[PDB]
Amino acid sequence: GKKMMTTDGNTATAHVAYAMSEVAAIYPITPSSTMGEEADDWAAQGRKNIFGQTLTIREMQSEAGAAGAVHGALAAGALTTTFTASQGLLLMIPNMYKISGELLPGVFHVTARAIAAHALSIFGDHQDIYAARQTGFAMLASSSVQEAHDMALVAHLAAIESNVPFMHFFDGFRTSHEIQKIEVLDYADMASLVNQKALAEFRAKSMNPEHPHVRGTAQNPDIYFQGREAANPYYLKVPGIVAEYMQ
Amino acid sequence: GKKMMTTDGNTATAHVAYAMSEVAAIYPITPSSTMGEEADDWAAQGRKNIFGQTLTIREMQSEAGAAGAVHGALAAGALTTTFTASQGLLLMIPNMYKISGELLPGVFHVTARAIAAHALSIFGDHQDIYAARQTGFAMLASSSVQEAHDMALVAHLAAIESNVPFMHFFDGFRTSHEIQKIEVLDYADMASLVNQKALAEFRAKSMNPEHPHVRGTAQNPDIYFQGREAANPYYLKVPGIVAEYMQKVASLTGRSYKLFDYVGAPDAERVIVSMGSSCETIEEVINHLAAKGEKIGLIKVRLYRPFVSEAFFAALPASAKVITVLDRTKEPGAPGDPLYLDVCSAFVERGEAMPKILAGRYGLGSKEFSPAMVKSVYDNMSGAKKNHFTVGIEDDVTGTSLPVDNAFADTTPKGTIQCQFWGLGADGTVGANKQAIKIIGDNTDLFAQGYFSYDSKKSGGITISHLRFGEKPIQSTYLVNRADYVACHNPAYVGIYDILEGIKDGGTFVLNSPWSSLEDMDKHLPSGIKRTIANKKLKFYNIDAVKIATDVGLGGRINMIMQTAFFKLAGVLPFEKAVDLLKKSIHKAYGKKGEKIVKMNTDAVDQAVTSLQEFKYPDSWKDAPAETKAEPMTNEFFKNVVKPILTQQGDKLPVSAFEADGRFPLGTSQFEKRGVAINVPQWVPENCIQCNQCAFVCPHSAILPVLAKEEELVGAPANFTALEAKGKELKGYKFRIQINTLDCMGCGNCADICPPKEKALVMQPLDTQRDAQVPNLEYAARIPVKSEVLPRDSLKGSQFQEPLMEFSGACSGCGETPYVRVITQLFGERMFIANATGCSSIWGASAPSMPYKTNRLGQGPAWGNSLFEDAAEYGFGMNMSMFARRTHLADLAAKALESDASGDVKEALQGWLAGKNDPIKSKEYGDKLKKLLAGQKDGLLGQIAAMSDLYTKKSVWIFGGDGWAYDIGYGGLDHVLASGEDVNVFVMDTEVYSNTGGQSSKATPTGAVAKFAAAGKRTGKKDLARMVMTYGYVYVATVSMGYSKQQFLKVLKEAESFPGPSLVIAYATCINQGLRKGMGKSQDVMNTAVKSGYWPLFRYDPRLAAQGKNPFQLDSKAPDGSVEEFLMAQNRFAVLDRSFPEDAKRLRAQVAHELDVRFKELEHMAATNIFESFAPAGGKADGSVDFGEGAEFCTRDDTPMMARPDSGEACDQNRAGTSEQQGDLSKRTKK
Amino acid sequence: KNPFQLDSKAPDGSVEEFLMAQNRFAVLDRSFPEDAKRLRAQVAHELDVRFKELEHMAATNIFESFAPAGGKADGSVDFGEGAEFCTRDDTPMMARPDSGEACDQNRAGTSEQQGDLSKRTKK
Amino acid sequence: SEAFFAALPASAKVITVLDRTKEPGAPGDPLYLDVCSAFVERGEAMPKILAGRYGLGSKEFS
Amino acid sequence: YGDKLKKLLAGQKDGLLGQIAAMSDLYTKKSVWIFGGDGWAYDIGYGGLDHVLASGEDVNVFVMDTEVYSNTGGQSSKATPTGAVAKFAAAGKRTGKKDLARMVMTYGYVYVATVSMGYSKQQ
């Protein structure tokens, strides 16, 4: 079903992120802090995600740490998400290359915020998200509180089916803190859109000593290039998948 | 003024960086490490910069720390520089925005290297520098060793005058490690080009309390945008500044450059736009093809940022009809790569002629970019005009690759001599080639080029040297493919590698082998080589280098002999002068000790010159009989992927041969069987006491204990000698220590510690053991491992378990691998491993060799390397997933208990729920559930059935070196241990950054010599163990296999079973430490490490505290006074004694003092009655509360940072005073 | 002399009031009294033990010396200089301008094992 | 690019690409560069393309 | 002496004395301070703080411990004590306060101290 509620971009997004994730490794940074805190509150109130479980949330020592933990959780077969922006997003860049390089369905929700240069600013612009455009993450933008809810859902669904990580972003403050009356979807409806076979395949290919594999090898000039191009088929399908889920 | 010099890109740019800098904040990372190390040597040697000062160099904990320090130094008015690459550069990005944002004249010298995505790569490409293109740094590229020097100078000069920081970059390895004879400027000349007025302004605007200012303010929407645009004028001027300095430097060097430079036909119709080393090869091809009438050209990009379209067009022929932009990177999903997008913008903004523009990708991770490939690119422009293509690979999955015709003719200038050398690691080939380059370059007018390809294998690895000499400049930035001279310094290569590939007709082929007679040669030399030598009329030379070396007294060392062969047969110099020059250098070099050493080498040359006679072969070789295929049985994957790669054919594997996510299967090292040991152990059953200590200690799992029953030895080979198994539980079994001679590395640790005075293990030549032991190992390998007879965690019993990490590429005698192998024998089947980058990730997972394997049930360590800095967090994430998913399983189990599931299922579910986090019980009941629910796909029972790989409690381990644990990953390690979660951290402390070249780490001890501690480290070893013990709830212990294997096993079980965080620090010997008597003494050194008191053993167990007992337990005894001999037995300490006896004495005494005080401290800890013994845990419940709920005063401020959905209620903001003060005021103003 | 000096005194027993006078502790007592009670008692235990440790540190006679700096000496030496066996591997990571010289790579056993084999073979 | 053009009116003669960022020294900001490449690859009509920067640090965009 | 040099070399613009004259803002020994909250010192900047202290150089670190990430909205840090309620510790933090002071004291060559204005301004 649908529900008419008045909230900001942060909460609209957290609403979806909570439902679609099993694990969340986080670190606070304005103006994305609200999402992680809302998530922690809901987990305490016993809110269940689409799997009927409360979200597993842990705070790290920094965003670099949060990104490493997100990478680990995904590698070990858990749907994972995080919330960040600006300086924090920059610290996640190294792991973003790894997350996309290993084709993991992670979803980063980012409140687009300025980068500290001649001065620091907690306000909105796309400096941070553009700084991560080469990481290999799909990037989906929402331009309103209502769109934040909708795109957040598309991002999770598309990440799961495509195996390509997604960065859903909306303007810091201008959208993250703007309050609007919008309609959200019940968690049951979100669950009905999940590609269950893709999800099961994600778990089957994950790290597990019962059926191990090696990831993160070191490669010489003889094969690195071919290995880097092997993921092309997946990126080629991303657009169609996003389009289909929007529908 | 100037001066010639043969060096590599790293050294060429460090030469400039040192002169132009006052401060350098650094961190090591391949392939830029050399720059920092050269700078440190020069500072110590007394080298001064342009200010007459020694460079102030400091090493940080990571590149993030280095960038921060660079920022601070610049802000404080000091000219600063740093050297980095790849992962390192990424960590500097945040500070780069600040450095450029504050208009500071910093200069970063970067060896462009690939970024770790599907896999890690230390090789060259532009993925890293493109990642920082939006930071605001000006970006200047050099395409050759000579250019690296010139551009480095321009960058420094331009940064100072423009106030915009620069990133000078050149290709990792392809330029950074390529050797060339070049010309460098004196420091005085560099100093004369500095803009003194700008420099003075830099000092005056810098941070200083006598004329302070505020920097790094926080700004609101009202002024931020304006502040960001205020630097526009500075960026508009940097291009002109760079152009002016290129001209000023040119007035001194004679080498001119422009922001964009064009080469080729002035009326070119097809043009390539490229950047970096590829430009040299492209220009070489253009000179060759243009001479044949082809209208082709190339635009070389020097200044990438800022990108000046005007300068780009100034270099573009108006006749160009097709242009292809080559990008050495890959940005998935982008409409095009960086350089291509910039060029496209130039044409759209110009709004005039619109040539056809194509985008091409090349050279990722140093992939070859040869003349043939360049030909493909030009041909594409006159043919199919494929866009967004790749070149250098066969993309049979998406078809984006251009076909490459390797029949393309050699394009090197006339007179160029090209040589290839196939050597075995440690045989001196590389060193000799480098000396040859120096000698020839210093005594002739010839340009010289050197490039070396190494092996991922650390010991007994193969090296291939590529050298070129010519009368014309050498622009061949690609491997030699058609050599005039080919030398094979290892006879073993003759049958496994295609050594004569591409050799020119009439070329010279020198071979090092004892096959002098024509019968022996025909016997060992393969038909393929015979035919090639015959058909190409090759001047074939064979020399028994080993025999000559031994005869002259050089103990069989062949380096001097093969050096003579090159100088006499290469054809680069007239024989007479060659031998003369060689001998002169033999006096230059060596000569150190008695004239004897000099004479031996002199005689070696003379004897060599005489023996170097053309081996005459029969014309019958024209068609020698091709042999068959004696290839043993192996995996489909090994024969189709790893073998081809191991035989240096990896480049021929198409994209379809790899997994999209980069994963590799476990156990591929099982079939390598390299056989590179010189000597291996021979078991002597008459003296064996069946203790299994030899198998326990092996760094490569080359010893297989065999416990078999009579019926199992029926078909056993005649020499499969077995003893009556000693022990009461082994009554009836036969025992045998089977040596795996082909996987053995010949270190000698096993034989060194074998208990009996009359050794049961004796080292013997590999050739005297292989014929008998190879079939024996195969037979033994088929005998079921008896893992149930003895306790899995007992010394002897652990070796009756399947080792799940074997035959890795670790050095012979490595001190890290024995520990890991044993850990897998205790928890292997259920462990996750988050491995930090370092030696353990290198011997652990260098493609295509995977040493980790599965047991007989297909279970094995799930291994992964994220980054160097995040190992703990990565592992913490794996633990989080398991917590979440197993909690989900438990939820379903509980639900199933309140359903109509059968009695048997409920019993098992109940049992599993009760033993959920118990390794034994979770498996016991999980296994019952796997049977009971087999085939179930419906409802609740179906979901539970699908989660079978979650039934048994898993063991999450985080493996890492001291560099990771004490330095770069310490912040994350600390947080993860502080979390209280169930993870196990195993630190292999080598007391230095081993894999990168032995740099000092905070784990390095006082007085130890290592890079950046070349006078002996002057700060003590960081006490990681004691710091972590301050938490009280983290299990902490130290181990040393050599001292006590029992204590080690005890620690492993205690640490792993602890229901919280565990940290185990192990003493790992390493070649960098320079063990005087050999790595085969590792166990003995580990033993002394503890006995001397240097490395005390102890355990800190929180569960003892929970039961009123002292958690700290000391496992070793007070120092026995042997520390002095312990230290002097290692070169890392001994070298200091030989070089600086005064300081060495004092430093070794300081060490003796440190361990004395530390042991006493540990003793007090073990006797204290002070420790926490409160509730283990419990609680949590359901619900939470906000910290501000019901507060009497405002709990949040009026800032946008604290604003939340529910904030905004009225509250007392503390502007009216205290509650009492307000009450009193109310009472006083009653009214 | 002992570097550690304690400037305050043993817990005076006012911690309970100290904690309850702050909402960050008091709010938990109102919402989860059971847990709050345990956690406040745990804090008191933690500080009791920590103060005792600090007292020990102040009474100890076990400690190292101290020297700000001094030495360095104009010069340096590579850790591999004069080593009996190779100190660097065959990897491109350890490759340096001056690397490449022959050395014993530990594939023939220890110094004594090698010397013994020579003796046992001679010929 | 195909989806971008599917949303572009054939009648468009002038196009302004607004980027909410600043990459010092770049020939243009990210979105502008992507759009330029789209037109270059199409090889057809080339309307005038303009680049504009706005909204840094929540600057009003009214 | 720096102040004497400022007077004696006033106007000096040429040669060696001119160079020394232009460096007067370097005459007096400066005091380098690093200011940060507990989140910085105990969490995100800890690895850096640890390394800088281990260096043995003359720097001064002053940590204002509010036992929470204050500016961002009161999130828990490793400096947050047992039982304190903060964001991500909404049921009372269940791990004790990290002992940064004792960890740094293990080096032996770093000066470490704790202060509390309300207890003693003199200390």
Ligand SMILES: Cc1ncc(C[n+]2csc(CCOP(=O)(O)OP(=O)(O)O)c2C)c(N)n1
């Ligand atoms: C961010 C980053 N900086 C630097 C490096 C280079 N690097 C990789 S491993 C390593 C040293 C590892 O030392 P250690 O942790 O002691 O392990 P060892 O090789 O001694 O076993 C260095 C400097 C990197 N990969 N990533």
Ligand SMILES: Cc1ncc(C[n+]2csc(CCOP(=O)(O)OP(=O)(O)O)c2C)c(N)n1
């Ligand atoms: C890389 C990065 N991550 C997160 C932030 C957001 N942030 C800025 S300050 C801060 C907390 C400050 O806490 P503390 O150090 O205790 O100081 P206090 O405000 O309490 O005095 C956080 C989470 C940031 N600016 N940069």
Ligand code: SF4
């Ligand atoms: S010599 Fe070394 S590698 Fe060989 S079996 Fe013995 S311990 Fe293992």
Ligand code: SF4
């Ligand atoms: S170490 Fe020696 S005595 Fe012990 S099992 Fe091995 S060969 Fe036998």
Ligand code: SF4
């Ligand atoms: S730790 Fe040392 S001995 Fe082991 S592989 Fe690394 S460099 Fe070699």
Ligand SMILES: [Ca+2]
């Ligand atoms: Ca544990």
Ligand SMILES: [Cl-]
């Ligand atoms: Cl913030």
Ligand SMILES: [Cl-]
């Ligand atoms: Cl490296």
Ligand SMILES: [Mg+2]
């Ligand atoms: Mg190490």
Ligand SMILES: [Mg+2]
């Ligand atoms: Mg604080």
